[PDB]
Design a protein around this ligand. Structure first.
Ligand SMILES: CC[C@H](CO)Nc1nc(NCc2ccc(O)cc2)c(N=O)c(NC(C)C)n1
Ligand code: NA
Ligand code: NA
Lengths: 290, 256
């Protein structure tokens, strides 16, 4: 680590600290993810073990590139490529005028390519949100932060329940389904799609119950017809208010028919019928992507 | 469905790459297949004591064989390797991995916490953090989808047979996980229902009964001779009703 100079604190991740840094010999700009091992006394954390192992299996233009892992007796550094901006910050800087529609389509297309690849290599990301999506000056967008990720099986077993940041969390998680899978990632991308178009979070809940009710108010409270088994789910309550589905031209006003159709399929309640990353790429919405 | 085919394709590709060197034990000066078998059988019991998944056990065995493919270990350190491997596999695979102190405890203080953690670092270094390995179990659960409705006895017996293969480096290190799984599933299907390796799986995998035959010949023998094997923890495990007592069922005498 002698050869890296720290330039600035980027932030805190799923664990540890991120720095922008420069290789003092080559000039190469990187992002360093530091993990202090002595302050856990349980060894290398699972978050780190999974991020590293799964990233070495995920080489793709829309997945952030892990360059090296430097493993001291005292510390552990993941060395990644550096990208200059995250999507959350880009949305804030475009908060008035909007992100132009072709760039929103381009970014969604790229995010889906990255995600289809993850799912094709049996990886669930489980923390898709604008803060974890990184953009370079070339117009590329990349999935980042695989610390909450996990390698899944066919078919799936029960996995960790405390997953996905609240605003981006799928209804099958909130309602406590025994099984979840790739669909939870699609839900998150659907929320991100809509957030790019409207310039604000689609479902900004402050609790699990508040989150559910915001989803219900927009999409309609689900019943046995739209989602078989829903009223029997662990955290489903018969007292839940019955709201009617809002017309998608109030939910996402700037979008054409194709856009609205793709969003509705990404936010489909029944995870079995929610569109796949692969099928989403073949949606008519993308026939003119650049 | 979209990506189920792709996952299968991708795992078939990684099982070649995450294979250990077949004859590594010849090149180990102080340790043998017999000591390896003792270690794996002990890991089965650790898995039972901590109610760990079968996938975790299978991943641990992968890690151990890979490590011993490139590193010389004295016999009194072989258990330390196995402990660190089981810890790593637990972190990868489990929702609630046991803590390091519990792992020290099941070695009966043969090692310290410090030793287990330093070995964890060394195993990670030697395997270059490549822990997402295909296992027999990952192929089995896919193969099981091609019997509808699921026969829980077949599934438990197939798992049992796949687990026994972990115990004996000779001959099972020369087969790939997808092949062992295929043999295991045919054998389990045949024992319980009289059915064979289905047409749908010949299409999915590209394996015929005849390509499975050499592994199936070995696995039949291992099954027949299981009650007399020196290692017995797997047989004991699979007596429980959780696994429909399938280790008590009589192996077929011939396969035709
Ligand atoms: C806060 C942690 C996240 C990681 O999801 N932010 C982030 N931002 C990154 N860049 C956007 C950014 C750049 C400069 C800043 O001052 C702030 C954000 C970034 N660069 O690659 C990066 N790299 C990870 C792969 C470790 N991580
Ligand atoms: Na719906
Ligand atoms: Na030897």
């Amino acid at each position: 680590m002698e050869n890296f100079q720290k330039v600035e604190k980027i932030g805190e991740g799923t664990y540890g600290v991120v720095y922008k840094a420069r290789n003092k010999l080559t000039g190469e700009v990187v992002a360093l993810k530091k993990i202090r091992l002595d302050t856990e006394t349980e060894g290398v954390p699972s978050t780190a073990i999974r991020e590293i192992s799964l990233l070495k299996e995920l080489n793709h233009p829309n997945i952030v590139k892990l360059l090296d892992v430097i493993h001291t007796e005292n510390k552990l550094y993941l060395v990644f490529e550096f990208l200059h901006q995250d999507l959350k910050k880009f949305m804030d800087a475009s908060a008035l005028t909007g992100i132009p529609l072709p760039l929103i389509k381009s970014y969604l297309f790229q995010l889906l390519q990255g995600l289809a690849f993850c799912h094709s290599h049996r990886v669930l990301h489980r923390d898709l949100k604008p803060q974890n999506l990184l953009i370079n000056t070339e117009g590329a967008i990349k999935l980042a932060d695989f610390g909450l990720a996990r390698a899944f099986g066919v078919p799936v077993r029960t996995y960790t329940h405390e997953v996905v940041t609240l605003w981006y969390r799928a209804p099958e998680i909130l309602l406590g389904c025994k099984y979840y899978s790739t669909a939870v990632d699609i839900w998150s991308l659907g929320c991100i799609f809509a957030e790019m178009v409207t310039r604000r979070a689609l479902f900004p809940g402050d609790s699990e119950i508040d989150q559910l009710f915001r989803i219900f108010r927009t999409l309609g409270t689900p019943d046995e017809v739209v989602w078989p088994g829903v009223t029997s789910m662990p955290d489903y309550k018969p007292s839940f208010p019955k709201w009617a589905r809002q017309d998608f031209s109030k939910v996402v006003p700037p979008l054409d028919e194709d856009g609205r159709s793709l969003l509705s399929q990404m936010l489909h309640y029944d995870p079995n019928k929610r569109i796949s990353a692969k099928a989403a790429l073949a949606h008519p919405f993308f026939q003119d992507v650049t | 469905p979209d990506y189920h085919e792709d996952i299968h394709t991708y795992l078939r590709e990684m099982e070649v790459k995450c294979k250990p060197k077949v004859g590594y034990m010849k090149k180990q000066p102080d340790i043998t297949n017999s000591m390896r078998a003792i270690l794996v059988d002990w890991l089965v019991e650790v898995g039972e004591e901590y109610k760990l998944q079968n996938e975790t056990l299978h991943l641990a065995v992968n890690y151990i064989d890979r490590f011993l493919s490139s590193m010389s270990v004295l016999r009194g350190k072989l258990q330390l390797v196995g402990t660190a491997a089981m810890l790593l596999a637990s972190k990868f695979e489990e929702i609630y991995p046991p803590e390091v102190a519990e792992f020290v405890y099941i070695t009966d203080d043969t090692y310290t916490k410090k030793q287990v953690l330093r070995m964890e670092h060394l195993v990670l270094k030697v395997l270059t953090f490549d822990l997402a390995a295909p296992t027999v179990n990952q192929f089995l659960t896919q193969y099981f989808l091609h019997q509808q409705p699921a026969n829980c006895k077949v599934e438990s017996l197939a798992m049992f047979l796949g687990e026994l293969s972990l115990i004996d480096a000779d001959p099972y290190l020369k087969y790939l996980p997808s092949v062992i799984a295929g043999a295991a599933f045919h054998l389990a299907l045949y024992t319980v229902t009289g059915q064979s390796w289905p047409e749908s799986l010949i299409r999915k995998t590209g394996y015929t009964l005849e390509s499975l035959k050499p592994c199936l010949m070995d696995l039949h023998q291992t099954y027949l001779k299981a009650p007399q094997h020196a290692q017995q923890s797997i047989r004991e495990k699979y007596k429980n009703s959780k696994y429909h007592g399938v280790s008590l069922l009589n192996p077929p005498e011939t396969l035709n």
